[PDB]
């Protein structure tokens, strides 16, 4: 839904998207055999599959594929500075496959643009989209355009005729942050079988131990999880599944 879904916006108006708790697993994805780039700054996905962030955010936009490199912490250029700047601490990964496939618009793909002529240098995570006629010189711009003055947005005209370097790649900016409250998505959670009547180790929703698991005739309230005894020892588990 927030990944492989339709078109987007121009990177100069690069969009944002918030992600919830829903467990997740990068590694379910990571090996999706589509990520032309998974340049992954924070940690390897095969490692952060269980990494829990109070916040995870997705950005996505249509740009000339090349800009991928500019989407490395420590980059410059009219786009890496005038259309978006990642931070040099982007705990995240640069997901992207390609736009030219679904973005060619053989007669010149428009729909996406870029404030080529922006004033400020992009602060990391700046979502700013304020268009303006900056002073290419000192002719007081205030609208003036035609000499020493122009507006910021220019044409990201992608064609199939022009080469992949001048063809667009679909580009995603991943970014996640874990504060201090109860965090959201918490990687994976494996599942063995209910091996019973024999001495085994067990991990029942974090309750670890060793013993022999049999069937009980006990029953307790639908909200309790495990039962203890007089001496404060676990002797009953409600199979989390």
């Amino acid at each position, epitope marked *: 839904e927030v990944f492989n879904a339709t078109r987007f916006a121009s990177v100069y108006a690069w969009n944002r998207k918030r992600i919830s708790n829903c467990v997740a697993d990068y590694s379910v994805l990571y090996n999706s055999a589509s990520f032309s780039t998974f340049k992954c700054y924070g940690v390897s996905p095969t490692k952060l599959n269980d990494l829990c962030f109070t916040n995870v955010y997705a950005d996505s936009f249509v740009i000339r594929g090349d800009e991928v490199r500019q989407i490395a912490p420590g980059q410059t250029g009219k786009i890496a500075d005038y259309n978006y700047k990642l931070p040099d601490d982007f705990t995240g990964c640069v997901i992207a496959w390609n736009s030219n496939n679904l973005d060619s618009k053989v007669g010149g793909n428009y729909n996406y643009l870029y404030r080529l002529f922006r004033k400020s240098n992009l602060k990391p995570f700046e979502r700013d989209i304020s268009t303006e006629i900056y002073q290419a010189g000192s002719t007081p711009c205030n609208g003036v*355009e*035609g000499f020493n003055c122009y507006f910021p947005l220019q044409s990201y005209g992608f064609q199939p005729t022009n080469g992949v370097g001048y063809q667009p790649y679909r580009v995603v900016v991943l970014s996640f942050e874990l504060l201090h409250a109860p965090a959201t998505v918490c990687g994976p959670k494996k599942s063995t079988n209910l091996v019973k009547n024999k001495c085994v180790n067990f991990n029942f929703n974090g309750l670890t131990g060793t013993g022999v698991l049999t069937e009980s005739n006990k029953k307790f309230l639908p909200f309790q999880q495990f039962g203890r005894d007089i001496a404060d020892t676990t002797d009953a588990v409600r199979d989390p599944q």
Partner: antibody
Amino acid sequence: QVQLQQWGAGLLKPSETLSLTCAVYGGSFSDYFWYWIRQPPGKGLEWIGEINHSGSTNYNPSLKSRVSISVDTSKNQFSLKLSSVTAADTAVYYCARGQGYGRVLLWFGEWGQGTLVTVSS
Amino acid sequence: IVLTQSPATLSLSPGERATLSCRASQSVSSYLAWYQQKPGQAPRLLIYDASNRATGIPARFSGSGSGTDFTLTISSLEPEDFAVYYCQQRSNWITFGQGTRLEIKR
């Protein structure tokens, strides 16, 4: 490499029109505000022409003259056709690759000589 | 407005702190370029926009100069530094150079 074939000028009686096919050589030139300049023989070069990739096909405000600039986006080179020459045009014409402050008028062609004289040497 | 340079014909020897003045009256230090023409060659992009020296052209041309009297300071005159300099006012309809500031190697 990045070059501008100043071409199309020639010997001229200072009353008719002329041309400058300052052909963009080695240029993916559909992104720049290509300007032009004019050097009186034995002097410095004063900016005259200024096409704009965004649009704005215009000139020196002091020389807002009949001489007309355009970029043949097909061939992707700036035109600056020297229409209806007068005496005050007597100089040499060039063209250049400019951006204002991102960059400035950077890439220059060799030279385009307007022989604005009837006489031949 | 017209700028003008100091040593119009600066007959300096190589290895000298060659430095060209550029006094204005409209004070467009928000630009003020500086190019060296070789005769028989259209001069290109030496210096421009405040002082940002486009490279390949050595750092010896220590750019400086603000207000109205600007001043590029060549560190050392050198055997390749025999040419004509052009401090370029811009930012208005006056995108003009110097009055052909010549520096003569000696």
